[PDB]
Amino acid sequence: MYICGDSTECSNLLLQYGSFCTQLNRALTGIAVEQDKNTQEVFAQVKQIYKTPPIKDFGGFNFSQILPDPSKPSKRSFIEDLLFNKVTLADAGFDIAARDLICAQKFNGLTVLPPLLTDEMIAQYTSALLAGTITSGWTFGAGAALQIPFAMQMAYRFNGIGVTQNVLYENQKLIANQFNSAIGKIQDSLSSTASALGKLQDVVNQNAQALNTLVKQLSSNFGAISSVLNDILSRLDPPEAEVQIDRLITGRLQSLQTYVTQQLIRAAEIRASANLAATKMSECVLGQSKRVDFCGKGYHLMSFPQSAPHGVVFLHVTYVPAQEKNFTTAPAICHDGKAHFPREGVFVSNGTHWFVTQRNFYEPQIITTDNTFVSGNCDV
Amino acid sequence: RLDPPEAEVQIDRLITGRLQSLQTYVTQQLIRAAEIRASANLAATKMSECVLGQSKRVDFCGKGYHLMSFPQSAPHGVVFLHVTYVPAQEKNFTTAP
Amino acid sequence: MYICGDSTECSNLLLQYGSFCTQLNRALTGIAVEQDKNTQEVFAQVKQI
Amino acid sequence: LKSFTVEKGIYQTSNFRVQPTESIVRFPNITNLCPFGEVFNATRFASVYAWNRKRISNCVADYSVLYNSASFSTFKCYGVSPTKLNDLCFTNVYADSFVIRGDEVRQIAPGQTGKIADYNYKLPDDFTGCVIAWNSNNLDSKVGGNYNYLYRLFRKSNLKPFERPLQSYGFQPTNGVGYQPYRVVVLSFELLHAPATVCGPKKSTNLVKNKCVNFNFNGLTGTGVLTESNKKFLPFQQFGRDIADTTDAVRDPQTLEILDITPCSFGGVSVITPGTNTSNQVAVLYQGVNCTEVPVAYSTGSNVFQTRAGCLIGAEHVNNSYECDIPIGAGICASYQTQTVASQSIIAYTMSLGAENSVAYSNNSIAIPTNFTISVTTEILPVSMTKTSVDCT
Amino acid sequence: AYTNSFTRGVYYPDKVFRSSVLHSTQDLFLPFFSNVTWFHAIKRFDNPVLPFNDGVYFASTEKSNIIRGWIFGTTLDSKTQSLLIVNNATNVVIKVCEFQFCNDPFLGVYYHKNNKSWMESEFRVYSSANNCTFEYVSQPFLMDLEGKQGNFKNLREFVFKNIDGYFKIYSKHTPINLVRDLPQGFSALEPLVDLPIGINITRFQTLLALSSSGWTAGAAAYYVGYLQPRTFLLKYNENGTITDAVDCALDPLSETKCT
Numbered sequence A: 001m002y003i004c005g006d007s008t009e010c011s012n013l014l015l016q017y018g019s020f021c022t023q024l025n026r027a028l029t030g031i032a033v034e035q036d037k038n039t040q041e042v043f044a045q046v047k048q049i050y051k052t053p054p055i056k057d058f059g060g061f062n063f064s065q066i067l068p069d070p071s072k073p074s075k076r077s078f079i080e081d082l083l084f085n086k087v088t089l090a091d092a093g094f095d096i097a098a099r100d101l102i103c104a105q106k107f108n109g110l111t112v113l114p115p116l117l118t119d120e121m122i123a124q125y126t127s128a129l130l131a132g133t134i135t136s137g138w139t140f141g142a143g144a145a146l147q148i149p150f151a152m153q154m155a156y157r158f159n160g161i162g163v164t165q166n167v168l169y170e171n172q173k174l175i176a177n178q179f180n181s182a183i184g185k186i187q188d189s190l191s192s193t194a195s196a197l198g199k200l201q202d203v204v205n206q207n208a209q210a211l212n213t214l215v216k217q218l219s220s221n222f223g224a225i226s227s228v229l230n231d232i233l234s235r236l237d238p239p240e241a242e243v244q245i246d247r248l249i250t251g252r253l254q255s256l257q258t259y260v261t262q263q264l265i266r267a268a269e270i271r272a273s274a275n276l277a278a279t280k281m282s283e284c285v286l287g288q289s290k291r292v293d294f295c296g297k298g299y300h301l302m303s304f305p306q307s308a309p310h311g312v313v314f315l316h317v318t319y320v321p322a323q324e325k326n327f328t329t330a331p332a333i334c335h336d337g338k339a340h341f342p343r344e345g346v347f348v349s350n351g352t353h354w355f356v357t358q359r360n361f362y363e364p365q366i367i368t369t370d371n372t373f374v375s376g377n378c379d380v
Numbered sequence B: 001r002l003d004p005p006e007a008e009v010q011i012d013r014l015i016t017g018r019l020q021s022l023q024t025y026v027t028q029q030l031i032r033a034a035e036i037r038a039s040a041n042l043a044a045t046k047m048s049e050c051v052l053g054q055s056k057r058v059d060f061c062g063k064g065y066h067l068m069s070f071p072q073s074a075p076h077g078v079v080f081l082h083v084t085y086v087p088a089q090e091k092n093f094t095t096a097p
Numbered sequence C: 001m002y003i004c005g006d007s008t009e010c011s012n013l014l015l016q017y018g019s020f021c022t023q024l025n026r027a028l029t030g031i032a033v034e035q036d037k038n039t040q041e042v043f044a045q046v047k048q049i
Numbered sequence D: 001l002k003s004f005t006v007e008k009g010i011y012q013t014s015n016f017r018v019q020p021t022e023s024i025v026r027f028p029n030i031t032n033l034c035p036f037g038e039v040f041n042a043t044r045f046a047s048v049y050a051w052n053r054k055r056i057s058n059c060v061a062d063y064s065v066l067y068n069s070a071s072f073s074t075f076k077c078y079g080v081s082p083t084k085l086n087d088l089c090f091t092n093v094y095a096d097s098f099v100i101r102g103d104e105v106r107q108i109a110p111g112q113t114g115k116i117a118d119y120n121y122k123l124p125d126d127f128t129g130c131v132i133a134w135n136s137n138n139l140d141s142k143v144g145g146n147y148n149y150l151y152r153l154f155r156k157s158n159l160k161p162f163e164r165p166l167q168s169y170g171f172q173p174t175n176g177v178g179y180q181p182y183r184v185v186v187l188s189f190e191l192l193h194a195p196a197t198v199c200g201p202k203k204s205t206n207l208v209k210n211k212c213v214n215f216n217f218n219g220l221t222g223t224g225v226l227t228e229s230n231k232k233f234l235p236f237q238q239f240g241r242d243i244a245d246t247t248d249a250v251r252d253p254q255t256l257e258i259l260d261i262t263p264c265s266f267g268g269v270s271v272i273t274p275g276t277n278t279s280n281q282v283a284v285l286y287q288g289v290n291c292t293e294v295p296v297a298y299s300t301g302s303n304v305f306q307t308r309a310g311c312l313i314g315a316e317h318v319n320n321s322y323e324c325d326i327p328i329g330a331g332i333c334a335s336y337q338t339q340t341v342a343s344q345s346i347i348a349y350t351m352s353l354g355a356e357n358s359v360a361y362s363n364n365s366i367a368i369p370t371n372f373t374i375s376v377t378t379e380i381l382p383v384s385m386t387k388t389s390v391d392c393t
Numbered sequence E: 001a002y003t004n005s006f007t008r009g010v011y012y013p014d015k016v017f018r019s020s021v022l023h024s025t026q027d028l029f030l031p032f033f034s035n036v037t038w039f040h041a042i043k044r045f046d047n048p049v050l051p052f053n054d055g056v057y058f059a060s061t062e063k064s065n066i067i068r069g070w071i072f073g074t075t076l077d078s079k080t081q082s083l084l085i086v087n088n089a090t091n092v093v094i095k096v097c098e099f100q101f102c103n104d105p106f107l108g109v110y111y112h113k114n115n116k117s118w119m120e121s122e123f124r125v126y127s128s129a130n131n132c133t134f135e136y137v138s139q140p141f142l143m144d145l146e147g148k149q150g151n152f153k154n155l156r157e158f159v160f161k162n163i164d165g166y167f168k169i170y171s172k173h174t175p176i177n178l179v180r181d182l183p184q185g186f187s188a189l190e191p192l193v194d195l196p197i198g199i200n201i202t203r204f205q206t207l208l209a210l211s212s213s214g215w216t217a218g219a220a221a222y223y224v225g226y227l228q229p230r231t232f233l234l235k236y237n238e239n240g241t242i243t244d245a246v247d248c249a250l251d252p253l254s255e256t257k258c259t
């Protein structure tokens, strides 16, 4: 249809080349199936659709801005709605279409197949992941979800990053306030700024521009007398009009091949990105990652996924040391000709006295036989 | 059938078509090879991190808490048998921080 | 310049082929920008010398 | 698939497109009519050697009223045909009207003997201009004889062809065939002098809407569905183009109204089938089309389920929710299942993401496993593909 | 005087309706900020045969049709067919004939100056129609030619083009507020008339309708800009009216905008 829209003679000429159309259709179908597989791999990672309990007694933490809002017809969170509003299409409805696709490309044998998973289902998957996280830590990623109070889950995470849980149990209110403030700041930043979703916007714009150029190529002579097949047919006798029609067929076939190659390469890039997103989901949402700078900057604590048009958004929660003090340190200590080394921690001195403390938070303690293990003698 | 002075048109048409077919095939093969190389790099990393060692990365070497993996060669590919630990029966208790 | 180097007749003939030249220029420019992006991502990881 | 057995899945097949029902042609009214009537009904023409030339241009040289008239005796076009006259555009047409004796009509033929021929009006061998001759004995015959049409064209000075025999006694009503006066008009036209401005009448058909038709507005040909539009063209604007430079609106030349254009519905056709060995029953999906139009191209149906991905035919719609088996799109999946019992058929449903669950989270409740299971799972990864070297030459 | 236009000379290059589209066209246009000659429509009779270099942009601030019409052709001596667009207060009489052109074909009416009456000293605007090929007279309309000095509201901007033998006239009656030099603003010119004349035009001339002792010179002037093949970026609003344009070769910023 694209090459020879409603022209029996042009179709008969295209039969000469033959299988190019089949090749192009096969490639595009493979791309579409790949897109669906990508979305499936990224999101469909929960065997069950967990749901948060009605009472949101999460140890002072407040997730109201990321959990689903039942009031809205689409059970999306506040931030998810923010993202959906920020990302805006370019050409026309892909979508909210209650009729034909309603696009310029539709005029020339170009159709956009709807994604297998609707935005409501993507939001449901995201909600399941988030509820499972906040209610059962990382256990739902390894087996049946096991409940645990959120304060205790945070204590486990702190133990994970190498900070004793007493720190959290003593600064719980401050930590909850900081987390809520950070969430509010993220919401405000997304609401105000517009370049946050540059990647998704660029993807949409690239696809729209590619289709637009493909359609625009239908108006080029490619060396023929005219770019209108009916015009050529009515103005020339068949024996010579076949030459012009062949020129047009060659030009349009080349345009299609260029478009399909561009789409294949772009799909490779998007598949790489989707594989990275799936890995990030598995390793940061379903668990806690020791890999540096993978799930955000700082020591990773947890992450929450949020669905966005043609993409995903992660809210990486990280622990960042804030205020440092200068201390004097020694690798070991000599007591009775025996060298005592810290069990876990480091020896520090405020200037007159020596203490042993954990490495990531100043909590001085007396140096006793419990904190240290003997090894060798002094002189070594 | 045709004489040399007039067979160049036909030979040129055939050459153009067949050269286009070859170029399309080669480009498709290049893209497929890139995809296969990505898959092979993933497989090499999986071997290094699950067979030669124990992985803490979640859902990398199978579902559950990873214990060990065993490789098994397959035609044009590899098969990993991820051995994992999976909690089974949960009894719920009261707890305090 | 590559195809019709300094030839008005050749340029006018080439104008009938559409946006092929524009597409090629866009692709090469994208690659060029992505190279700098790669180097930046790899090396500029600490904003403090 | 080039196979006698097909596996479970959904496969694309021949695309489906609505064919145009009828052809519609619209053109502006034919108003500027050439002065053929006055040229051919003049009271009397000039002398044969002083034939009057009238330039006809910037009009429509309709011939329907001309040829169909039976009042004419002889009319032959040696370079064109009346059938193709209407579909031909002329730059300019000149009419040479004169009255000659019936005998001279033979001399009027191009390349004919007789010095009178090239003395009065020579016809070159390549004269494509149509010639009309009709008897006018009563009109041009005087009771005593019309001697104004003197035939003494034997001048001593030679007149070459297109330089710029007194056998007639008197034109009377009793004159026999070949001697009566004849009114002869020549339709001489030229080309390559100015942009074409003389064209035959162009027919017009009635206007239709909401039907896939082949339209032709002022030479703008295309296929689509014409619909009344709320757009407001400016007076001098005719067409309407889109962002992709594709026509989407048009103005009817006769009635100045703006009609939207929508491409005739089309889309791929997919066949949803379980394994061939499992059964031969199938269901087809017309992608991106509502099946108020599907029967145009299983026509009876008995099972049509309009989905967001196109109308589905041959599949029962049930609002249970199972794991997706054969994806369709927009959140719909198809599967092969029994129950009503027996009558194994293909069903369509909204896929289920999984069993609902609600963790019993509480301020002070923790669930600790008391037992484990060792699970072994297999993961497959391609590592290489067959080598292949090709000799290009 | 070497006046400069600012954003004038924009006309709809075709008959296509576009809404909220930034279409770009490569057609003959008046370059933005270009030197446009300024004449004195007056002993001192300003009425030369200005060249017609593939298009001409004509603008004026006259009333009652001081500049009646125009002459087009290549010889302008009745040896070759020449267009005559002589307009009057009722209707145009567009006429292509080998009309004989007088050396001083101007009406010359000293009207309402001293005698307070409309007198016609001579009628040598027409000399002779010796040979013709085509003529066309339009409907006897009546433009806003009534005497009303006030503030000039007749910026009769015109554009004349000749391509493929077709003669095109774009025009638009844009009222203004300042009687001084050309004002600042934007107003697209709609097509007015098209003709399949097909003659070859190399020069053109204007026509005027208006002894030497203490003669009060008429207060009127007309500008003559020249078109040139250029690329413009035209903005169409919701109603498909060209609201703004960019000259894609004026300066680097405009070139970037076009890109």
Ligand SMILES: *[C@@H]1O[C@H](CO)[C@@H](O[C@@H]2O[C@H](CO)[C@@H](O[C@@H]3O[C@H](CO[C@H]4O[C@H](CO)[C@@H](O)[C@H](O)[C@@H]4O)[C@@H](O)[C@H](O[C@H]4O[C@H](CO)[C@@H](O)[C@H](O)[C@@H]4O)[C@@H]3O)[C@H](O)[C@H]2NC(C)=O)[C@H](O)[C@H]1NC(C)=O
Residues within 6 Å of the ligand: A350, A351, A352, A353
């Ligand atoms: C590095 O850190 C250590 C510990 O903070 C500092 O060593 C000082 O140790 C004492 C505690 O032992 C800190 O607080 C003091 O406690 C005294 C009671 O504890 C006994 O030990 C101190 C000295 O360590 C003796 O002086 C004292 O007599 C006791 O036998 C208090 O008596 C001290 O003074 C007053 O304390 C409170 C007010 O806080 C009063 O109610 C008491 O009645 C008493 O009058 C003192 O409180 C002391 O702060 C530590 N000093 C410092 C500077 O921190 C090291 O000195 C410190 N090194 C540096 C450079 O800062």
Ligand SMILES: *[C@@H]1O[C@H](CO)[C@@H](O[C@@H]2O[C@H](CO)[C@@H](O[C@@H]3O[C@H](CO[C@H]4O[C@H](CO)[C@@H](O)[C@H](O)[C@@H]4O)[C@@H](O)[C@H](O)[C@@H]3O)[C@H](O)[C@H]2NC(C)=O)[C@H](O)[C@H]1NC(C)=O
Residues within 6 Å of the ligand: A062, A063, A064, A065, A184
């Ligand atoms: C968790 O964080 C959320 C975001 O901060 C908190 O939501 C905020 O709650 C307060 C009141 O508790 C709201 O302040 C009110 O805003 C309404 C606006 O009209 C409607 O919307 C608010 C949204 O909550 C709703 O509470 C109202 O009743 C209305 O339905 C005003 O009309 C009120 O006068 C009052 O100012 C905040 O608007 C609301 N959002 C934000 C960004 O502050 C939520 O309370 C926190 N949950 C906890 C601590 O348990």
Ligand SMILES: *[C@@H]1O[C@H](CO)[C@@H](O[C@@H]2O[C@H](CO)[C@@H](O[C@@H]3O[C@H](CO[C@H]4O[C@H](CO)[C@@H](O)[C@H](O)[C@@H]4O)[C@@H](O)[C@H](O)[C@@H]3O)[C@H](O)[C@H]2NC(C)=O)[C@H](O)[C@H]1NC(C)=O
Residues within 6 Å of the ligand: A174, A177, A178, A322
């Ligand atoms: C570690 O980092 C934390 C966050 O930076 C620190 O917590 C902050 O500590 C101050 C002092 O206790 C708190 O301020 C107290 O409570 C309110 C807060 O409103 C005032 O906030 C700032 C000072 O933060 C002040 O300049 C404004 O004018 C407000 O009046 C006030 O009543 C007092 O300022 C009072 O000091 C902060 O609220 C608190 N921030 C948070 C998020 O909790 C903490 O102190 C740092 N050091 C340690 C050992 O934890």
Ligand SMILES: *[C@@H]1O[C@H](CO)[C@@H](O[C@@H]2O[C@H](CO)[C@@H](O[C@@H]3O[C@H](CO)[C@@H](O)[C@H](O)[C@@H]3O)[C@H](O)[C@H]2NC(C)=O)[C@H](O)[C@H]1NC(C)=O
Residues within 6 Å of the ligand: D036, D037, D038, D040, D041, D064, D065, D066, D068, D069, D070, D071, D072
């Ligand atoms: C000169 O005028 C007379 C009428 O007084 C013409 O007689 C015409 O004869 C033809 C048949 O041979 C008919 O023509 C008709 O034309 C009118 C439209 O003008 C319409 O009735 C039909 O289309 C039909 O063809 C008709 O009998 C009659 N025409 C008219 C108007 O009365 C005669 O043909 C004219 N001779 C010329 C132009 O040489």
Ligand SMILES: *[C@@H]1O[C@H](CO)[C@@H](O[C@@H]2O[C@H](CO)[C@@H](O[C@@H]3O[C@H](CO)[C@@H](O)[C@H](O)[C@@H]3O)[C@H](O)[C@H]2NC(C)=O)[C@H](O)[C@H]1NC(C)=O
Residues within 6 Å of the ligand: D027, D028, D029, D253, D254, D255, D256
């Ligand atoms: C081609 O010819 C027609 C004929 O005039 C032009 O428009 C026509 O104008 C008449 C005006 O009387 C329309 O008649 C109308 O009839 C309705 C019937 O209800 C009546 O309500 C109106 O008051 C009016 O009398 C006629 O329908 C209309 N026909 C068309 C096709 O427009 C037409 O403008 C001409 N088109 C061109 C390109 O020359």
Ligand SMILES: *[C@@H]1O[C@H](CO)[C@@H](O[C@@H]2O[C@H](CO)[C@@H](O[C@@H]3O[C@H](CO)[C@@H](O)[C@H](O)[C@@H]3O)[C@H](O)[C@H]2NC(C)=O)[C@H](O)[C@H]1NC(C)=O
Residues within 6 Å of the ligand: D232, E238, E239
């Ligand atoms: C041209 O573009 C404008 C802006 O998009 C379109 O808006 C319409 O402009 C006219 C102004 O003449 C509005 O009419 C006015 O409405 C007010 C409020 O009702 C009324 O008080 C005035 O007396 C006058 O009637 C009109 O409401 C406004 N909207 C629409 C749908 O017309 C305008 O429509 C466009 N004009 C065209 C396409 O012809």
Ligand SMILES: *[C@@H]1O[C@H](CO[C@@H]2O[C@@H](C)[C@@H](O)[C@@H](O)[C@@H]2O)[C@@H](O[C@@H]2O[C@H](CO)[C@@H](O)[C@H](O)[C@H]2NC(C)=O)[C@H](O)[C@H]1NC(C)=O
Residues within 6 Å of the ligand: B092, B093, B094, B095, D360, D364, D365, D366
């Ligand atoms: C969870 O356990 C309760 C019973 O165990 C109690 O609650 C645990 C959370 C834990 O704190 C244990 O140490 C407690 O002894 C099960 O349901 C309870 O049944 C008892 C007796 O009727 C009643 O007192 C509780 O209110 C019930 N609580 C709930 C939530 O049902 C419950 O079935 C166990 N499983 C789940 C998913 O809740």
Ligand SMILES: *[C@@H]1O[C@H](CO)[C@@H](O[C@@H]2O[C@H](CO)[C@@H](O)[C@H](O)[C@H]2NC(C)=O)[C@H](O)[C@H]1NC(C)=O
Residues within 6 Å of the ligand: A098, A099, A100, D289, D290, D291, D292
């Ligand atoms: C196919 O035909 C049916 C006929 O009803 C269309 O149903 C319409 O759906 C739209 C969307 O809400 C409504 O605005 C109309 O009122 C419905 N009725 C009619 C007669 O159109 C259906 O939308 C069509 N499918 C398309 C255009 O994709």
Ligand SMILES: *[C@@H]1O[C@H](CO)[C@@H](O[C@@H]2O[C@H](CO)[C@@H](O)[C@H](O)[C@H]2NC(C)=O)[C@H](O)[C@H]1NC(C)=O
Residues within 6 Å of the ligand: D317, D318, D319
């Ligand atoms: C889906 O459940 C609904 C129940 O409402 C059924 O759909 C319609 O329900 C009302 C009666 O409650 C009636 O319109 C018909 O009984 C049903 N109409 C149609 C077209 O189905 C329906 O039976 C169930 N199955 C589906 C939608 O596949």
Ligand SMILES: *[C@@H]1O[C@H](CO)[C@@H](O[C@@H]2O[C@H](CO)[C@@H](O)[C@H](O)[C@H]2NC(C)=O)[C@H](O)[C@H]1NC(C)=O
Residues within 6 Å of the ligand: E087, E088, E089, E090, E091, E092, E093, E137, E140
């Ligand atoms: C300007 O054109 C008008 C109207 O066409 C002239 O009025 C008549 O025009 C036709 C054709 O030029 C002539 O045949 C008539 O003799 C004219 N009659 C009269 C009374 O004028 C008009 O003369 C022209 N000039 C002016 C100043 O109006």
Ligand SMILES: *[C@@H]1O[C@H](CO)[C@@H](O[C@@H]2O[C@H](CO)[C@@H](O)[C@H](O)[C@H]2NC(C)=O)[C@H](O)[C@H]1NC(C)=O
Residues within 6 Å of the ligand: D193, E081, E097, E098, E131, E132, E133
């Ligand atoms: C000028 O007068 C002459 C007749 O004296 C005619 O010009 C002829 O026009 C036709 C058509 O263009 C040509 O084929 C002839 O060659 C011309 N002959 C001469 C001598 O020029 C006509 O009546 C008038 N044509 C014009 C343009 O004014």
Ligand SMILES: *[C@@H]1O[C@H](CO)[C@@H](O[C@@H]2O[C@H](CO)[C@@H](O)[C@H](O)[C@H]2NC(C)=O)[C@H](O)[C@H]1NC(C)=O
Residues within 6 Å of the ligand: E074, E199, E200, E201
């Ligand atoms: C003006 O233009 C005309 C044509 O537009 C020239 O006359 C001839 O026209 C034909 C077809 O256009 C060409 O093949 C000839 O080459 C033209 N003659 C010449 C000498 O070039 C005409 O020459 C041009 N000049 C004048 C003064 O009219």
Ligand SMILES: *[C@@H]1O[C@H](CO)[C@@H](O)[C@H](O)[C@H]1NC(C)=O
Residues within 6 Å of the ligand: D277, D278, D279
């Ligand atoms: C699948 O096809 C094979 C060959 O016909 C047959 O042996 C087998 O029973 C079939 N399996 C089914 C219908 O489940």
Ligand SMILES: *[C@@H]1O[C@H](CO)[C@@H](O)[C@H](O)[C@H]1NC(C)=O
Residues within 6 Å of the ligand: E002, E003, E035
């Ligand atoms: C254009 O006009 C200005 C001043 O009127 C003058 O400085 C400039 O030289 C002129 N440009 C040309 C090419 O004459």
Ligand SMILES: *[C@@H]1O[C@H](CO)[C@@H](O)[C@H](O)[C@H]1NC(C)=O
Residues within 6 Å of the ligand: E110, E111, E112, E113, E114, E115, E119, E211
């Ligand atoms: C006024 O009329 C006289 C003749 O009586 C004439 O000489 C003079 O030129 C006229 N002046 C004007 C302005 O018309």
